[model samples]
Target: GADPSLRKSGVGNIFIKNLDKSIDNKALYDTFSAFGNILSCKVVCDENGSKGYGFVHFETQEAAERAIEKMNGMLLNDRKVFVGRFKSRKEREAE
Candidate 1:
């Protein structure tokens, strides 16, 4: 498989918090993809609810910057979003 665009030689991981129960990782996907690039992300989950936050690991740091601009604290849900970097994961499980 292949994509219409080849990836860059580097990456910049993302961090997001202060979201809502109105969306999922795909929303993060589109939100970041709404402005920047993509790689992988899924908010850690609890027994029945883990729908408040997620990360946005961008393939290019520029896109990462833009995605940070597009969503971070910009009031998409009108709830102030807080974002960061360097929070990559390892089998996120909260059980």
Candidate 2:
């Protein structure tokens, strides 16, 4: 079993999407953890499959931006990816 923390995200929440199915928690961590201190890392998956997306909560907003710049349009596990400063439209205030 794993703690697999899931929450509303922090100030440095980095939104990553368009992911390949092969990616899991550790892989996501391996990729983005280098940018800065990560508060958390998650590859949004379902009971049966992946969400084709994920999230990385960085300790610094600077780290979030760094990964956004470094990862945008970049390839991860041979698939295209997108990175951004959190969802712009409808994310609610997380507890």
Candidate 3:
């Protein structure tokens, strides 16, 4: 079982956008894992093509926050990336 406190505290997952299609899973994983342990990392894709977005789930919320702080607006694969806490579609729509 996962720790409730860890899940409840901090930003455990981050959303990244403006990623280049050339960047693969390993590349994205390596980029964020430098900040802390990653629980999961994925680059979204569909039959049409790359979604230009992805999500990174960290083992701790602090790790996610650190990555967001240091990586937001940082360039990767020549494209500037936007990194921040993952927000659901409903949350974004409500905003």
Candidate 4:
């Protein structure tokens, strides 16, 4: 169960995009775990392989924003990544 304070706090969510096909959610989580306490990690998937996107929710908004500023346009698995706010699930599904 989550603590009431943590739930009441406004947590920031980070979105990772353009991930290499070989990368999994665990890799993504491990990458961001160095930056801050992660709330959750999700790897976007299609019928096969990565959909090239995912979300990493941080315990605090500051940590998430800092991660975005530091990691955006950085290379992961030889691919330059784009990180930002996650689009709505419906929008993602529609793509």
Best by lDDT: 2
Instruction: Write candidate 4's Cα lDDT for 1-95 as tens digits.
Output: 65322221336677788887767878887888788888777778776778888777787777787778887999888788888765444331211
lDDT of 1 by residue, 1-95 (tens): 64312222236566778776555677668767866667775665444545567766676677877776667776645556777654434323210
Q: Give each model's whole-structure lDDT.
A: 0.61, 0.78, 0.75, 0.72
Write the candidate numbers in order of decreasing TM-score.
2, 3, 4, 1
Stretches of candidate 3 off by over 4 Å are: 1-11, 46-49, 89-95
For residues 1-95, could you state the per-residue lDDT of candidate 2 as single tens digits? 54322343466777888887788888888899899888777898865556889888887878888999999899998778898777545556641
Better candidate by lDDT, 2 or 4: 2
Best by TM-score: 2
CA error at residue 74 for candidate 1, angstroms: 2.3
Give per-model CA RMSD.
7.7, 4.3, 5.3, 6.5
Using TM-score as the measure, name the better of candidate 3 and candidate 4.
3
| Candidate 3: Cα lDDT at 59 | 78
Which pairs in model 4 have colliding backbones?
none
